[PDB]
Enzyme design. Structure first.
Site, PDB file in Angstrom:
ATOM      1  N   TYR B 153       0.920  -1.152   0.000  1.00  0.00           N
ATOM      2  CA  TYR B 153       0.000   0.000   0.000  1.00  0.00           C
ATOM      3  C   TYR B 153       0.954   1.193   0.000  1.00  0.00           C
ATOM      4  O   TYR B 153       1.985   0.985   0.637  1.00  0.00           O
ATOM      5  CB  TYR B 153      -0.872   0.034   1.272  1.00  0.00           C
ATOM      6  CG  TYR B 153      -2.025  -0.999   1.280  1.00  0.00           C
ATOM      7  CD1 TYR B 153      -3.142  -0.845   0.455  1.00  0.00           C
ATOM      8  CD2 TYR B 153      -1.913  -2.106   2.106  1.00  0.00           C
ATOM      9  CE1 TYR B 153      -4.115  -1.795   0.464  1.00  0.00           C
ATOM     10  CE2 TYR B 153      -2.897  -3.059   2.110  1.00  0.00           C
ATOM     11  CZ  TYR B 153      -3.979  -2.893   1.289  1.00  0.00           C
ATOM     12  OH  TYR B 153      -4.950  -3.880   1.272  1.00  0.00           O
ATOM     13  N   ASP B 181      -7.037   0.141  -4.893  1.00  0.00           N
ATOM     14  CA  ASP B 181      -8.490   0.076  -4.901  1.00  0.00           C
ATOM     15  C   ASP B 181      -9.084   0.263  -3.494  1.00  0.00           C
ATOM     16  O   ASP B 181     -10.245  -0.116  -3.207  1.00  0.00           O
ATOM     17  CB  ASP B 181      -8.827  -1.295  -5.494  1.00  0.00           C
ATOM     18  CG  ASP B 181      -8.405  -2.481  -4.612  1.00  0.00           C
ATOM     19  OD1 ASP B 181      -7.703  -2.309  -3.607  1.00  0.00           O
ATOM     20  OD2 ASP B 181      -8.786  -3.609  -4.935  1.00  0.00           O
ATOM     21  N   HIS B 253     -10.537  -6.037  -5.137  1.00  0.00           N
ATOM     22  CA  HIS B 253     -10.407  -6.554  -3.784  1.00  0.00           C
ATOM     23  C   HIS B 253     -11.258  -7.713  -3.307  1.00  0.00           C
ATOM     24  O   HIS B 253     -11.169  -7.989  -2.133  1.00  0.00           O
ATOM     25  CB  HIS B 253     -10.572  -5.430  -2.828  1.00  0.00           C
ATOM     26  CG  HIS B 253      -9.353  -5.236  -1.962  1.00  0.00           C
ATOM     27  ND1 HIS B 253      -8.370  -4.364  -2.112  1.00  0.00           N
ATOM     28  CD2 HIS B 253      -9.176  -5.939  -0.776  1.00  0.00           C
ATOM     29  CE1 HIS B 253      -7.624  -4.504  -1.018  1.00  0.00           C
ATOM     30  NE2 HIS B 253      -8.114  -5.452  -0.226  1.00  0.00           N
TER      31      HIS B 253
HETATM   32  C1  LIG Z   1      -8.921 -11.842   4.042  1.00  0.00           C
HETATM   33  C2  LIG Z   1      -8.576 -10.984   2.845  1.00  0.00           C
HETATM   34  C3  LIG Z   1      -7.613 -10.045   3.020  1.00  0.00           C
HETATM   35  C4  LIG Z   1      -7.117  -9.401   1.931  1.00  0.00           C
HETATM   36  N1  LIG Z   1      -6.076  -8.563   2.133  1.00  0.00           N
HETATM   37  C5  LIG Z   1      -5.591  -7.930   1.022  1.00  0.00           C
HETATM   38  C6  LIG Z   1      -4.351  -7.213   1.244  1.00  0.00           C
HETATM   39  O1  LIG Z   1      -3.629  -7.224   2.243  1.00  0.00           O
HETATM   40  N2  LIG Z   1      -3.934  -6.466   0.172  1.00  0.00           N
HETATM   41  C7  LIG Z   1      -4.431  -6.586  -1.093  1.00  0.00           C
HETATM   42  O2  LIG Z   1      -3.944  -6.026  -2.072  1.00  0.00           O
HETATM   43  N3  LIG Z   1      -5.532  -7.376  -1.224  1.00  0.00           N
HETATM   44  C8  LIG Z   1      -6.198  -8.064  -0.223  1.00  0.00           C
HETATM   45  N4  LIG Z   1      -7.237  -8.940  -0.414  1.00  0.00           N
HETATM   46  C9  LIG Z   1      -7.789  -9.150  -1.620  1.00  0.00           C
HETATM   47  C10 LIG Z   1      -6.873  -9.682  -2.724  1.00  0.00           C
HETATM   48  O3  LIG Z   1      -5.720 -10.434  -2.391  1.00  0.00           O
HETATM   49  C11 LIG Z   1      -7.641 -10.388  -3.751  1.00  0.00           C
HETATM   50  O4  LIG Z   1      -8.464  -9.426  -4.356  1.00  0.00           O
HETATM   51  C12 LIG Z   1      -8.381 -11.678  -3.462  1.00  0.00           C
HETATM   52  O5  LIG Z   1      -8.931 -11.794  -2.182  1.00  0.00           O
HETATM   53  C13 LIG Z   1      -9.352 -11.975  -4.583  1.00  0.00           C
HETATM   54  O6  LIG Z   1     -10.601 -12.455  -4.213  1.00  0.00           O
HETATM   55  P1  LIG Z   1     -10.917 -14.004  -3.952  1.00  0.00           P
HETATM   56  O7  LIG Z   1     -10.364 -14.361  -2.619  1.00  0.00           O
HETATM   57  O8  LIG Z   1     -12.389 -14.040  -4.021  1.00  0.00           O
HETATM   58  O9  LIG Z   1     -10.259 -14.615  -5.132  1.00  0.00           O
HETATM   59  C14 LIG Z   1      -7.644  -9.636   0.683  1.00  0.00           C
HETATM   60  C15 LIG Z   1      -8.639 -10.533   0.528  1.00  0.00           C
HETATM   61  C16 LIG Z   1      -9.111 -11.209   1.570  1.00  0.00           C
HETATM   62  C17 LIG Z   1     -10.263 -12.137   1.215  1.00  0.00           C
HETATM   63  O1  LIG Z   2      -6.848  -5.565   2.359  1.00  0.00           O
HETATM   64  C1  LIG Z   2      -7.774  -6.110   2.979  1.00  0.00           C
HETATM   65  O2  LIG Z   2      -8.731  -6.527   2.313  1.00  0.00           O
HETATM   66  C2  LIG Z   2      -7.760  -6.142   4.395  1.00  0.00           C
HETATM   67  O3  LIG Z   2      -8.767  -6.624   4.941  1.00  0.00           O
HETATM   68  C3  LIG Z   2      -6.784  -5.285   5.247  1.00  0.00           C
HETATM   69  C4  LIG Z   2      -6.966  -5.273   6.772  1.00  0.00           C
HETATM   70  C5  LIG Z   2      -6.185  -6.088   7.586  1.00  0.00           C
HETATM   71  C6  LIG Z   2      -6.360  -6.095   8.956  1.00  0.00           C
HETATM   72  C7  LIG Z   2      -7.315  -5.289   9.538  1.00  0.00           C
HETATM   73  C8  LIG Z   2      -8.094  -4.473   8.735  1.00  0.00           C
HETATM   74  C9  LIG Z   2      -7.922  -4.462   7.356  1.00  0.00           C
END
Ligand SMILES: Cc1cc2nc3c(=O)[nH]c(=O)nc-3n(C[C@@H](O)[C@H](O)[C@@H](O)COP(=O)(O)O)c2cc1C
Ligand SMILES: O=C(O)C(=O)Cc1ccccc1
Ligand code: HEM
Ligand code: HEM
Ligand SMILES: Cc1cc2nc3c(=O)[nH]c(=O)nc-3n(C[C@@H](O)[C@H](O)[C@@H](O)COP(=O)(O)O)c2cc1C
Ligand SMILES: Cc1cc2nc3c(=O)[nH]c(=O)nc-3n(C[C@@H](O)[C@H](O)[C@@H](O)COP(=O)(O)O)c2cc1C
Ligand SMILES: Cc1cc2nc3c(=O)[nH]c(=O)nc-3n(C[C@@H](O)[C@H](O)[C@@H](O)COP(=O)(O)O)c2cc1C
Ligand SMILES: O=C(O)C(=O)Cc1ccccc1
Ligand SMILES: O=C(O)C(=O)Cc1ccccc1
Ligand SMILES: O=C(O)C(=O)Cc1ccccc1
Lengths: 480, 391, 480, 391
Positions: B153, B181, B253
């Site tokens: 980020y 995003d 996301h």
């Molecule tokens: C628990 C959770 C935490 C996530 N944290 C991040 C993150 O730290 N940074 C980021 O770029 N995307 C984050 N994502 C989303 C992406 O890595 C990604 O869009 C992915 O979850 C795609 O969706 P899917 O799990 O349905 O395939 C997170 C997703 C989930 C479900």
């Molecule tokens: O990027 C995400 O989708 C996350 O959920 C980041 C996050 C991690 C821990 C606490 C709140 C948000």
């Protein structure tokens, strides 16, 4: 003096005498023109109807709509005990208390409400059956009412990224006033059914008490008078708009309009979508266990031109349902139109206002009328992204009727402030994420309109094929 | 909430053997039954109403295949080249914040070990908000051959970022994914429900000020290939092209940022023709994620142009019930669905996945129906099947 | 003699010895090429596997596919009691009898079956879990399998009226033979799982015993041999067609083809849609509680040209899934193509064969190939109007796999005759009502194809809005 | 089946007062709870699978209105002119075979009395297979003013028909409807299930030989206006025009004859432009029936061109629970929904119902969806509403 059994004599459909707070009235010519329908007065006629009456009518009404020589002198003493009507709660049993145990503090703390749908849920549980029926019904088996919300779901977004959306500002201006938020509370009849002590006064209070203040549209058929509701408004900077049904006795409208201009209301929303009231069966079913003179059914475009001459407030026609009438309104030079089907309580296969909005705004541009008519939208709006969808299509501002009736019913003025907060935050939050920092930047190019028309009715299907089919299953735990 | 007795009995020796896990949803059903509420709400959430979150997956169901028969398919090859490096399979583990919620003991070190312990080496994207240090994780990787990327980020205290970039580059990560995003945490009411105004959603870690110029400068300050993660319209693909970045991950996301955001596959389908008409396609790598849970979803994604596809949650819940071995198997499962399907489409190399293998004619039949006619239905009775004799 | 504990020595994945009816076999090189997958033989290896074997394999198989020097001499006496494998019924408990109480005469009298869906229902109840799983599954979460039937439902009709439809005749001709009915039984592997005594012999019998006789396509992986099935056919006027998987050892195919030409079969359906077997999870899940040499995965269009030279029967490629390969088949000059996705058990987002049929037939006409390729269709067909829809689009004839497996499983040969009857009557009845008196008159102009493409995936919707919404209700009886 | 105790207790004094019947489905819910199985299967059936039977109704839900506001609507008028005569309302009772199954005592005499006892006189179509003689029924009619029509199957012994025509004409019936969509009884498996090869469906009463020439001759043998009942494609509307008949009832028997037969409203929408382009529209009366259960369905039907619309089952089950008074009220209910809706569309005469009051843009969104993804759904949990305090 009028001897009470002489009163009761006239307990008839036609030639109905009734008692309200000591005085006696002849409710015969009156009966058929009653807003809810003559039924209620008929059933309970020739009695002391004061408990039905008092907790439900704007104080001013008898003096305002009943002929003076029909206001008959006082009932001698009182009415024989089973003739004093217990309060109107049709279908309610002793239930009044389990709904109050429900209410009594078992109502979650207001900080725990995450959205507008929580107020609805809470309000379907603790509200009285007359009030739940009345607040929640749609006309006639209800496809335009649910449609109003689902049509929003036929529109997705086209978010811009890597745009600095640090400060976002969502204020806009509506009918020549700068307003804090792009949405308003739409007129709702009888709010004292759900909030008996304060009704509309508490929505006046929640709209102007906080740091975000929202426009209140007051209803011509409100449990409170306009003069009470405007007095109860806590901020001189909050806005109030008046909604008018024009009566068959045009002088009554004439005096109503000059009175609310003087009281300070900033615009006139004339409701044209209800010549006849809509059949709402969930109420009808409860009253077992259409024209009238109050809303003149001959109102015509010539009446809105003559109404302009009589008033200085901007006039907004509320209830337009096709593009042809949005252009007609732009031609008689009125100030704006609310595309609304009355919350899907009137004509039941009417379209979703967002879908008509979409159809219209390109035409107002082809006809260079777009800057000379403000178009509002209501019905079905429940999430800040639904407000953004109407605003990107160019609605000047969006209204909500039921979400405010259920926040006010469950939590009174702080429920109405909490709902304003919930939605101000959803709009603002979803505007960062959509890459824009002001209402003026909300433009059609941020939306995908390509499946705006995907309104499908699927072919009935196949109960035998599906009754025998069996789907794949997930892994069973060794025990569970 | 005392459930910990139930849950510790649910995992401990009631979880089926890894060898009995047929598909990526099995992991989700078992993780949903054993994680702590706080973890399940954080992992399985979406931005309010979660319609893009379910839509992400379901748009895959709008695309049908056009298989070739009588094509020799004894030998099929699914390795591809993403971002300079040459990877074993066409898909990756995407960055999932705080993996220690499901996997307390090893967090994202265990995903590292699962991505390189077996035969197939699957890329790992490390979250800037990982609950293990970049150092810990990179260092846990089992092979010189598994490739690791960093999603970043950019912090409002930009020097924190400039330190972080220059140190991950030291740690040999192979590329940088700048997630863009999320200038503000979407409302994932599932968490909220169990757990500043419209600003609680704003954060110091993620900077709301990010802008294409910041990416331009970040180009000029690192050597790793940069991929903007979170593009959601063709225009931003074409801008990521004009400011010269390596890739774009067409993403939203996991349907936990704007909620009526389109499905990535629906946006790929539209962006890729444009990249061909504007001759800049060979410039850009376009990744896609959100909703892929089956090998055939991966293949629709590759047939349309995507260079590689990512997956968050399946890997996150495979990791949470079976740690690195669970992560390793989810990799096997998806590798076998991808092999089996190619052999059933009549193709042998990832390069042979082109669009003409796809019936895209009802890609826009994303429809909302008109309201069910409650009473016609309440009174209607359908046919009935035959009945056995009672006696 | 081969001493039985010396046998058991080799109880290993790789170097697997096993006992079937007294003789001993080395099932090591064999194991990985087994049709169902090596699993079954591995688990039960080094034992007397005769109960798994005997009630489930075409008698001819060991002698036909095992190398002769792998056919090892006899087991001395027998196997220590827990090493004689009890019959394969994975997941079945003592259940075998409640399913037999179900079966035993509680099965409704055959005259009471009104349709093809009744056999399915009856068969999901009394069939064994291996057989239900195997008969009913689709590949991989199953959207092409259900799709195959629903796509028929995207086509309505355009009936002609006041046409004298007194006599209607539904016979047609297929692959140069006049056939009584426009549909056929498609090849189904292992019918002895559902009908253990007779299997495919009873479908041979029900297809030719009555007054309507239907084509039978025999499977290369059938529990019975072709020579038993052709002997069991009761009418010299009934037709049999042979379905071939070509083996990696092409001489084996070579001898299989010359043997079924001599036995009398009238055409060769070569199944090309299964290089690799499809993942069918309902079976996989039961075996817890893809390539192989049997179906050569390198088959190519050059192999069907060389196969034509070797045979005089018309060759039909079964498993075509796009128009490009229907034209390719017309160019190598083969006799017809079955547009099929193997009952949606192979590649799972494959299209519905009626939808590809629709797309193709206009092209075969533009390319003046239409009269030189007969196109059959299967999958999903369950009602005589579904057969009429494929025939109006020009399919030469329609096949069914599961409806005949469940009629035969529940009622053996008379279930198969009763299903032929049920569907002959639905076709004929629905042809009067559609105004036509012969298959030749079934033309596209009797169909509405305008929403043939309405294959929608709706936007996920709205669990909160709908959880709180409450629909209108019907009138309550005074008591009920 | 002994239920007769339950049913005789269900009607007898548990049926709500007629004054509590809000809509035509109420009659159906109460009739479904009290009729004998043999009657309910005969009345409520459809041709196998009943998809045209449900589709008949649901195609109405594809058409949305375009209301006019600020139009004086104090006074609205719904009388129309069907087939020479001038009727009170734009809709009729259609011919329902054997009304004595639900109404043992009075059968179709009670529908006659309901169609003329009150204020509004609604046309009655008498079934050739009525369980009361034409004589009985006509003679039961309460008014000189209620109009009665005869639907006729032509018998294979044509002289039976020639007798029957010439005698009903004597009895003053005002027109003849020759039902032609039933050369063979559709399989209504509901009946069958409780109860010659594909020829049990053929009958002697209805003659399979009927042909346009027979209608041509029947023209030349009667004076009553003839309406072919059962047309199902534009071509047969245009032929009924070329052999000079009065009307055509666009129909398919209530979705109990061919089962993937289109919805009549969907066929009207298409036939009417053609009648205008071929200048023969003013020649033909086009009626429509199947699925109308609400006033707004009647109005979509009139806005598109239909001269009048019929209804079978609602009247049949109104008759079965409340006899003639039930028939009379169902007439009131539909008259008030039609009045109330016109006043809400901004129209005042049936002649003012034209098409421009209709959003017909999604008339062909008759769609079958692709199969529900059982497992994605089995593991997906949606949001949840707030909870009251337990204490
Ligand atoms: C628990 C959770 C935490 C996530 N944290 C991040 C993150 O730290 N940074 C980021 O770029 N995307 C984050 N994502 C989303 C992406 O890595 C990604 O869009 C992915 O979850 C795609 O969706 P899917 O799990 O349905 O395939 C997170 C997703 C989930 C479900
Ligand atoms: O990027 C995400 O989708 C996350 O959920 C980041 C996050 C991690 C821990 C606490 C709140 C948000
Ligand atoms: C004295 C003459 C009356 C007038 C002028 C009048 C006027 C109105 C008006 C304008 C409304 C809606 C808004 C408001 O309350 O101000 C209303 C609603 C209603 N009135 Fe009256 N009313 C009269 C008498 C009565 C009487 C005697 C009763 C008791 C039987 C009664 C019962 C009701 C009820 C219960 C409603 C709500 C309808 C519903 O249930 O949805 N009214 N009345
Ligand atoms: C001697 C070598 C064998 C050959 C050539 C062989 C061949 C086949 C073939 C061709 C089929 C399908 C059609 C048919 O039955 O003809 C089949 C299925 C099967 N075979 Fe064998 N087989 C062999 C040994 C075995 C043994 C030893 C077992 C016992 C473990 C076995 C168990 C099965 C089962 C249970 C299936 C069905 C798969 C399912 O459950 O869906 N086979 N075999
Ligand atoms: C209980 C209720 C009463 C209403 N009363 C009025 C009213 O007094 N006057 C008016 O013009 N509109 C009235 N409305 C409707 C409009 O303000 C408005 O179009 C609105 O309720 C839109 O629907 P929504 O609830 O879906 O937002 C009422 C709606 C409801 C639900
Ligand atoms: C149990 C089962 C086994 C099948 N075995 C074969 C087979 O041996 N050979 C073949 O070419 N097709 C096989 N088919 C599929 C085809 O005959 C055919 O396409 C068919 O089953 C179509 O599906 P339906 O059951 O929906 O009609 C099988 C299908 C089923 C359901
Ligand atoms: C019980 C029943 C019996 C019917 N009998 C006849 C009949 O005698 N002759 C005829 O022309 N139509 C018959 N119909 C159908 C038509 O009158 C008409 O199509 C009508 O039922 C339209 O469908 P609806 O009831 O759904 O409106 C019958 C319908 C029903 C439901
Ligand atoms: O405006 C409406 O929606 C109303 O419901 C009109 C009304 C007002 C008061 C009682 C009954 C109907
Ligand atoms: O043809 C099929 O559909 C089969 O299932 C192939 C097969 C045959 C016998 C056992 C396992 C698979
Ligand atoms: O026309 C119909 O729809 C009927 O159901 C006719 C009928 C009447 C009595 C027995 C069988 C068929």
């Amino acid at each position: 003096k009028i001897s009470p059994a002489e009163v009761a004599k006239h307990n008839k459909p036609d030639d109905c005498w009734v008692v309200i707070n000591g005085y006696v009235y002849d409710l015969t010519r009156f009966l058929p023109n009653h807003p809810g329908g003559q039924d209620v007065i008929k059933f309970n006629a020739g009695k002391d109807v004061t408990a039905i009456f008092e907790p439900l009518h704007a104080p001013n009404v008898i003096d305002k709509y009943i002929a003076p020589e029909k206001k008959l002198g006082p009932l001698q003493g009182s009415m024989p005990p089973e003739l004093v009507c217990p309060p109107y709660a049709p279908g309610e049993t002793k239930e009044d208390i389990a709904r109050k145990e429900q209410l009594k503090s078992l109502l979650p703390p207001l900080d725990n409400i995450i959205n507008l749908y929580d107020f609805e849920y809470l309000a379907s549980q603790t509200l009285t059956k007359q009030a739940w029926a009345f607040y929640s019904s749609g006309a006639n088996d209800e496809v335009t009412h649910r449609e109003n919300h689902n049509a929003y779901h036929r529109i997705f977004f086209k978010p811009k990224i890597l745009v600095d959306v640090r400060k976002v500002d969502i204020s806009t201006d509506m009918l020549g006033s700068h307003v804090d938020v792009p949405f308003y509370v739409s007129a709702t009849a009888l709010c004292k059914l759900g909030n008996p002590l304060e009704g509309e006064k508490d929505v006046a209070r929640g709209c102007g008490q906080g740091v975000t203040k929202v426009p209140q549209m007051i209803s011509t058929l409100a449990s409170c008078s306009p003069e009470e509701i405007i007095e109860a408004a806590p901020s001189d900077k909050q806005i109030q708009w008046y909604q008018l049904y024009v009566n068959s006795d045009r002088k009554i409208t004439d005096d109503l309009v000059k009175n609310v201009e003087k009281l300070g209301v900033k615009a006139l929303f004339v409701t044209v979508d209800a010549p006849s009231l809509g059949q709402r069966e969930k109420d009808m079913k409860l009253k077992f266990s259409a024209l009238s003179k109050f809303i003149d059914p001959s109102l015509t475009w010539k009446d809105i031109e003559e109404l302009k001459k009589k008033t200085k407030l901007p006039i907004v026609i509320k209830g337009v349902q096709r593009t042809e009438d949005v252009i007609k309104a732009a031609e008689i030079g009125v100030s704006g139109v609310v595309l609304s089907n009355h919350g899907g309580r009137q004509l039941d296969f009417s379209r979703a206002p967002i879908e008509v909005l979409a159809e219209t705004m390109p035409i107002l541009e082809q006809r260079n009328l777009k800057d000379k008519l403000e178009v509002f939208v209501d019905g079905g709006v429940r999430r800040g992204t639904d407000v953004l969808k109407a605003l990107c299509l160019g609605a000047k501002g969006v209204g909500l009727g039921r979400p405010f009736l259920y926040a006010n019913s469950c939590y009174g003025r702080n429920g109405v402030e909490k709902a304003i907060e919930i939605l101000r935050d959803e709009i603002e939050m979803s505007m960062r994420l959509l890459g824009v920092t002001s209402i003026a930047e909300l433009k059609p190019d941020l939306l995908d309109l390509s499946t705006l028309k995907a309104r499908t009715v699927g072919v009935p299907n196949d109960v035998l094929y599906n009754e025998v089919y069996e789907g794949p299953t997930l892994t069973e735990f060794e025990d569970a």
